[PDB]
Amino acid sequence: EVITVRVQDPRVQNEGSWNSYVDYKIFLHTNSKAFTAKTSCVRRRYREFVWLRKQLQRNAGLVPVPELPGKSDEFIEKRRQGLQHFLEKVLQSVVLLSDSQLHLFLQSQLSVPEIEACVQGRSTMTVSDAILRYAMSNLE
């Protein structure tokens, strides 16, 4: 199985107005049975990556999570490479690769809050066949 991730095409959304910001296109080309989309295209702010790293650190327990680049056109390009490097490294850690929140971040044009939603409460397997039976009987 082969996974390719490039971070291309930096663009300034909302030119000149105060909520001006830069997002980056994340092109994920896979043929891996781990992922769903075999080519995928999503735009992500830097602040979204900052969230993603904090989220990877929770689920990864004690597995090291690659660093992000801290702190125009030259800086944008330095960060662009840094973001690509970060994802390249993340996709090589098999534990991190299995994070559902990462899978939604990379493939899914969901917001961060929408990803935090699509992931809630324990699965119906990682729970006592008693809590699951209590769940199954609910009402109006």
Add this chain to the structure above:
Amino acid sequence: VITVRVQDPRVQNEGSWNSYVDYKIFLHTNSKAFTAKTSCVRRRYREFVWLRKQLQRNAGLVPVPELPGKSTFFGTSDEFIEKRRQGLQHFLEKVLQSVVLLSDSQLHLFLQSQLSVPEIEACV
């Protein structure tokens, strides 16, 4: 081409009385203009029950696929969840092939909005 999978059953509100199970609906489409459109929403079974009744109203005389009830089932818990999960996916797969049902706005909100049922009844 439109693809729908119903995956990742989960228990929201573990142990407390308003404990319940919802299912992730992954709707993956492509126009050849773009690359891949996705979409991810969690839905209770009772939400599907509503959706079917709503599809039947607007569909006039077009047959609406069946949902999985509780029938002759001897299995484990985890087994029932998985039987229902397939049943729900089957139901949506069938619904998405009926061109009339596919054009229901309430279905489009159910599959692609993170709106409540009452919020969908409002938006319409």
